[PDB]
Structure 1
Amino acid sequence: GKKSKATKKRLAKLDNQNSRVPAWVMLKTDRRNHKRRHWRRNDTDE
């Protein structure tokens, strides 16, 4: 499949949203990424 520029920006964003909650937020809140999406297990849009 051939992706467009906008489709690429969205996929790019979804990949960034897939990073873990930083180590410092755990210490600041004194103690979970609920939007964890896998390439196989989960499904994106379009």
Structure 2
Amino acid sequence: GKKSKATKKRLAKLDNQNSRVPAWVMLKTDRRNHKRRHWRRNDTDE
């Protein structure tokens, strides 16, 4: 495929959202990333 600049920005975002909940959020909230996507198992928009 050929990605446009905008397409590329959205792909990047999705990639970033795919990171984990930082360790400290755990301690602070005294105890999951409900948006953990996989390139293979999932399918993004567009």
TM-score of the two chains, using structure 2 as the length reference: 0.98
After TM superposition, give the deviation of residue 14 of structure 1 in Å.
0.1
**Runs of 4+, deviation exceeding 6 Å:** none
Partner SS state of residue 14, structure 2? helix
What is the CA–CA distance in structure 1 between the aligned matches of 2:35 and 2:43, rounded to whole Å? 12
TM-score of the two chains, using structure 1 as the length reference: 0.98
Q: Which has the higher helix share?
A: 2
> Aligned pair 1:26/2:8, yes or no?
no
- Unaligned runs of 5+ residues in structure 2 are none
Deviations 1:1-46 (Å, cap 9, x if unpaired)? Answer: 0000000000000000000000000000000000010000011001
Indicate the percent of aligned positions where both proteins have the same amino acid. Answer: 100
What is the CA–CA distance in structure 1 between the aligned matches of 2:36 and 2:10, rounded to whole Å? 16
- Unaligned runs of 5+ residues in structure 1 are none
Partner SS state of residue 31, structure 2? coil
